[PDB]
Amino acid sequence: KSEIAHRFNDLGEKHFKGLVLVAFSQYLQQCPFEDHVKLVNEVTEFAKKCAADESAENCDKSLHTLFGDKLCTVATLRATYGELADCCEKQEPERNECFLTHKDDHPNLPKLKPEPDAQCAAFQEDPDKFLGKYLYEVARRHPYFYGPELLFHAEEYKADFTECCPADDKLACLIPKLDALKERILLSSAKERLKCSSFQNFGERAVKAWSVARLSQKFPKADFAEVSKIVTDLTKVHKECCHGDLLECADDRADLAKYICEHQDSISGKLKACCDKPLLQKSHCIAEVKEDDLPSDLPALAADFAEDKEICKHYKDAKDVFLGTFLYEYSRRHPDYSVSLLLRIAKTYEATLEKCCAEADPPACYRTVFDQFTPLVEEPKSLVKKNCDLFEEVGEYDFQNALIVRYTKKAPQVSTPTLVEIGRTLGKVGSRCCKLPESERLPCSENHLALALNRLCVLHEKTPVSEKITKCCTDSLAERRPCFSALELDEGYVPKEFKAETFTFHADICTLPEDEKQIKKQSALAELVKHKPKATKEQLKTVLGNFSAFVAKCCGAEDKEACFAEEGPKLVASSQLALA
Numbered sequence: 001k002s003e004i005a006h007r008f009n010d011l012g013e014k015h016f017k018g019l020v021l022v023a024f025s026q027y028l029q030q031c032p033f034e035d036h037v038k039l040v041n042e043v044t045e046f047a048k049k050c051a052a053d054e055s056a057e058n059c060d061k062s063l064h065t066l067f068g069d070k071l072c073t074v075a076t077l078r079a080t081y082g083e084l085a086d087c088c089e090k091q092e093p094e095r096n097e098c099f100l101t102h103k104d105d106h107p108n109l110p111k112l113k114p115e116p117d118a119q120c121a122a123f124q125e126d127p128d129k130f131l132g133k134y135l136y137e138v139a140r141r142h143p144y145f146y147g148p149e150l151l152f153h154a155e156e157y158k159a160d161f162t163e164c165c166p167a168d169d170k171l172a173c174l175i176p177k178l179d180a181l182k183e184r185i186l187l188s189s190a191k192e193r194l195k196c197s198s199f200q201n202f203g204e205r206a207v208k209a210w211s212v213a214r215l216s217q218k219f220p221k222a223d224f225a226e227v228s229k230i231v232t233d234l235t236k237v238h239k240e241c242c243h244g245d246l247l248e249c250a251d252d253r254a255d256l257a258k259y260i261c262e263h264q265d266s267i268s269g270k271l272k273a274c275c276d277k278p279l280l281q282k283s284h285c286i287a288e289v290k291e292d293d294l295p296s297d298l299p300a301l302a303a304d305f306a307e308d309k310e311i312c313k314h315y316k317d318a319k320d321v322f323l324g325t326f327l328y329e330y331s332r333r334h335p336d337y338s339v340s341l342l343l344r345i346a347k348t349y350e351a352t353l354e355k356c357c358a359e360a361d362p363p364a365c366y367r368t369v370f371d372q373f374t375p376l377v378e379e380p381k382s383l384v385k386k387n388c389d390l391f392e393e394v395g396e397y398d399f400q401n402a403l404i405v406r407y408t409k410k411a412p413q414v415s416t417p418t419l420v421e422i423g424r425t426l427g428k429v430g431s432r433c434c435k436l437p438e439s440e441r442l443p444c445s446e447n448h449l450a451l452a453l454n455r456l457c458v459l460h461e462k463t464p465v466s467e468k469i470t471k472c473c474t475d476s477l478a479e480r481r482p483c484f485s486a487l488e489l490d491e492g493y494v495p496k497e498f499k500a501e502t503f504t505f506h507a508d509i510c511t512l513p514e515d516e517k518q519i520k521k522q523s524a525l526a527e528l529v530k531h532k533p534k535a536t537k538e539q540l541k542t543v544l545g546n547f548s549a550f551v552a553k554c555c556g557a558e559d560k561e562a563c564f565a566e567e568g569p570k571l572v573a574s575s576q577l578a579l580a
């Protein structure tokens, strides 16, 4: 019984190689493309040998042993990866655990900057090399990217270049195709990173809870046993992928996609479109499937979960199953709620039973349990209404700026690039979610907010700067967004010392693209808040407007630098007075 042969036979050579390339790229993010390709081929050649004869020497070793041994043969390991050479002394599974610790969530690699003429040539010159290069580039930038899903995006990446290279207009799919794919890559990466973060920081229990809530919303027709079945299998898939077991992850994901499609009539009417597709496409469509219509025979929950006299007995006899059933029943009923809200509601239900069942007369106590949920629902609904009201009034750029001020005040010790990133991400959430139908706003906003907050938390694990951020990031997954919302200006913070050069602009800003100009100004905005943390958002908006006007004027000037030189220092000095 050869594991590597077993995976090679199940997956096929193409997907086997793709996943192995991705896995290696994620583990060793600094190595060049050619180096990894060689290791992939070496591993694949061995798999073929084992497929021919599974009794052969070393074919019965574990995948982690074989792939771990392979990574440790890389040239200049100690120089390039000083930390990783230490892992190579260790044995499995200790070695892989060491490997996973050293994955870098922020490698700070160059921007993709597609060159359509050169890339279409390389694509035509060698497609396998070209598509493989793409897997490699994204994988090392996103060390926790969902392995099988990255192969799906490589196919979209192929279809773009296939359709557009022979066309007349050279860059007819630059902004249209690659920028859209780039956006989908970011969202997908953020979604999977949350799952891996949940395993790491809160355990498998938290991942299953989240998954029960989400899949109940998606598949309200399905029975609890069906959802539990799917959650169990899907949790194992993500567990394997998050721990670098990409071949096993891909294989189990295929098995799950098959199961769902075989039982689609009892699961969801929306799956039929997904289930008449190829493998990678089918799995992707299932994963992103639209929520099914609510069945007309949804049961009233007051009887079982509020009015039944033996709830304390049920709760005590099997807490997991009873609470699991509640979460399933309440979630399928509420596609208009965010997942974290449903998890908060489930925690409040649990807490109510813990309290009420210790008292003398539990029934009278827990009779009003559903009424405790109302304030939990109103708070996020109010936040989303306020944020969307602001977004629709001022637009994305100014909405981003308001969020940068908001979060810099909460966490002024965090780096400016990180504060700008989260502010800009949460601004795009406005564009994405506030235009949706009204019932879909809350789930879209809060679910995306969870992704952006996790990004901040993951960067904070690497570079801790604030005890308040640690607390919100590690105390409770469900309470994370309310914790961050509750943060106010850190009074313990001492204003960052003034540096004139930080707010000094030059003629180089004028040649930049619009998004890059914004980031420079938004970076200055974060720095303004850091030096003057008590300045109001209204003061800051005005001062930034003056900076924007100053940049606009001097970029339209005959002598651009002389304009920046004369005008800048006065404005820099005057701005500080405006922020008192």
Ligand SMILES: C[C@]12CC[C@H]3[C@@H](CCC4=CC(=O)CC[C@@]43C)[C@@H]1CC[C@@H]2O
Residues within 6 Å of the ligand: 014, 015, 017, 018, 019, 128, 129, 131, 132, 133, 135, 151, 154, 155, 158
């Ligand atoms: C997965 C895939 C087939 C297998 C390809 C993969 C691109 C990268 C690659 C390079 C190789 O040298 C082996 C085959 C693989 C792994 C392709 C991208 C789309 C296509 O379906």
Ligand SMILES: C[C@]12CC[C@H]3[C@@H](CCC4=CC(=O)CC[C@@]43C)[C@@H]1CC[C@@H]2O
Residues within 6 Å of the ligand: 205, 206, 208, 209, 212, 320, 321, 323, 324, 327, 343, 346, 347, 350
């Ligand atoms: C997270 C949680 C404990 C673990 C529960 C979860 C409901 C769903 C569930 C079902 C299971 O089969 C395992 C335990 C879990 C994952 C509960 C909801 C609130 C409670 O705190």
